[PDB]
Symmetry: C3
Subunit: 317 residues, 3 copies
Amino acid sequence: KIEEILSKIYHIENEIARIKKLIAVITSNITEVVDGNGNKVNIIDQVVNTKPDNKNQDSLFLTYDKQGQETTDRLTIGQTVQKMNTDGIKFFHTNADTSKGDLGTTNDSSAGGLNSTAIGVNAIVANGADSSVALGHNTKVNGKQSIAIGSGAEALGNQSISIGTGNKVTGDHSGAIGDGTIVNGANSYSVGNNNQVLTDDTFVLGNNVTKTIAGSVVLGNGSAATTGAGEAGYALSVATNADKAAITKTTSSTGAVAVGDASSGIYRQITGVAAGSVDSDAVNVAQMKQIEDKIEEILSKIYHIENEIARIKKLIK
Amino acid sequence: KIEEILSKIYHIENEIARIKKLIAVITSNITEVVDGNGNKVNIIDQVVNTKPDNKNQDSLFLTYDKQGQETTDRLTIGQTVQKMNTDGIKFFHTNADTSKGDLGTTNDSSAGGLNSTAIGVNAIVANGADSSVALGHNTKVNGKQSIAIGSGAEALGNQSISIGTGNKVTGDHSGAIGDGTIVNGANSYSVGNNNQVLTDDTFVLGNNVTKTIAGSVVLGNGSAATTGAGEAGYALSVATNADKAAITKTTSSTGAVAVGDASSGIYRQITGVAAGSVDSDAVNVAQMKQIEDKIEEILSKIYHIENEIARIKKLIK
Amino acid sequence: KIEEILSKIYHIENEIARIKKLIAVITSNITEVVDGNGNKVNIIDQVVNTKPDNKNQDSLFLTYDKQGQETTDRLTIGQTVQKMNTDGIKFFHTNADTSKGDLGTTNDSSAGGLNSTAIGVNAIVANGADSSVALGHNTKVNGKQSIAIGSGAEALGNQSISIGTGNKVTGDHSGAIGDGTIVNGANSYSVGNNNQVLTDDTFVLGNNVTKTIAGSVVLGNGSAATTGAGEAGYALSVATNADKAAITKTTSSTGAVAVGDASSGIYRQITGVAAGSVDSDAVNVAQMKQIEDKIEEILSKIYHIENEIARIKKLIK
């Protein structure tokens, strides 16, 4: 039947028009979608940058340059993400060499401690160094609640602080601010350069200090504490018993305050010193001068007495 | 008409071949696109990792492990992004517990101040603490232009600095480096452990220091400043009027330098001290020895005078 | 031939059914893919957030708020990435103003040195300042292996350390902790506020200190070191030759320890001082009292001698 054939052909013609219609809309249907605001978003434009422009501050592909405070627009979302990943995010940038790390294949930081933070090239917090902080190239922290900041700073004791270039703090509850200093003493602190602090409860504000005593305080370039407890003070042997005990009562109890190093010819005046009042207060030159002046007054009475006696001796004869 | 039917069939056959052609290219057309370099990019491969490989340093899906300096390759771009987001980017890693924060549901840092930076687990800069820095687990900064670094460091005054474990600095323009120290004084600084600094313009380089006076400086473990301005120096009552005023001229103006604590039997020698020159310079043992030696020379003239007088008295009779 | 026409029509009907089948599966085929775990992933859901929910901690679109420790769920992957990029990742947040930077169009940090790390708004490490660290608003570091932390801290010398508000350290191997301090001296350190340290190997633990001598140590608010090497100690002119040389042997070698400033009426007692033993040890009040007491004993013998002599003179007549 012709009419049966014609009807099949009309139907097919209708199916074909409908097919072409479907085909038409597929694309726009697959790539164009509505986000949760009701904005139509094109999936392709979210993944591939349709118009790169380093100056377009609204680009979803934008990166913040690690130096110079400008931006760079990337080609795909993955590129953007990996640039962030290696060159930094805004306000957090590390400019790195191509070295190998001490622990693994990268030169990443390594935050090994629970609640630890590690920042910078080869900045390492050890496993177990909990609540610790490393910030800087080659920093290393092995202690709990410890801090290393700087180039090669190491904070290796518990509650250790190491700020500056290449200080190494092994003492617990200890620290060093400066460069090239080592602190092995516990409860000991150094401010300055090239110090070595082996003793406990020791403080150094100085450079090139290497001789200390526990409990000591060393002040200034090249000073040295070499004395501690039990140094008998200088006393006049012609002194009374009560006066010798008052001196003895002030006998040293612990490491000295050192302001120089007589060994090596290093001596500092102490200036701006108020007259002492009580037994263990320092004495100033004014207080010594009153004594000197009295010595002179005594000497002058003696000279006169000697004069009198000489005359008396002659008068007798 | 047969020929009319045949023609419709040929046309349809042509439309069908053309349809299949269109269908063929759709895919490659939808997913394969050209970026701004003219590189063909496959959208799917930008979003889903076609070949995960922890060692493939060019992977767009790569993450930098928070410890150990190795990498991990992720399955999708969103996974990569969220790993960066929680485990860190290269050179910026915090290894966190699963705690709740003090402010909100996460244990994130919180940079509350304008131009502030907050880093680490529960590291908090308060609203209004502008230009401030917190770096470390449980750090808290409430002051403007303030710095807390370490485990539980708090910098609560304006221009306050707190570096180490659990120091708390409330004073303005003040700071503490060490562990367990509190500084409430304004314009006051402590280096050391378990100090308490309540006074202003006070400096401590020491541990276990808790007694201070405004303007004082306390040096060493257990030292204590308990005296300030207006301490009348020790003076010989047999001294002249000019000599008493020279002493009085050097009377203390402010808190002492304390190197010990006579109360508790703590005393330190001061060593390396150069001979004083002017009135408010400290005196050393060498300068006291010259006086002692003169006392002996005086005593020996007196002994001889007494001898003479005794003979004179007998000679008279 | 009818039968030839019918056969072409049956074939076309079969092609049409097959086409519609292909069309059906395209979508699901293009967008639904298998990742490297064998999980089926929908490409669209990786790029566009199908259900935003600020509380959904598994969202691939989640951001960590820069303050308050809560999260925000974003609409597309690019939004997420750029929020991370500008507002921070978890544990690394800077809350920034809308300023211009000193170097470029943004207010980003700038890590100019190899292996340097720069963090915070307008935190700048210069080109060539290698292995250096800047952390804080307006920090600037120009030296190698240098550290600036705080608001406007500058570390401009090599191995320079500057922590606090607006300190400026130009000296090499030098540093300042505090606020408003300048250190131009090399190998010199200041703890405190508004100090100016022009000299080398100089240490200040104090505020408002501006007069120093190389090698000096200045302790406390307003103290001033104005003397160095070669100060001849106070000596009794009535002293022996050996005693004058012992004093001369302790003559100052370098900058003083200053605890006050006699110029401006500033004087501090030094308290807790143990009796000195050797020549360059400080002397305390106890050691001066033994001398004073002996002066009195001498004066009393002299008074008696004078008495005797007066009687002798009368007895003779």
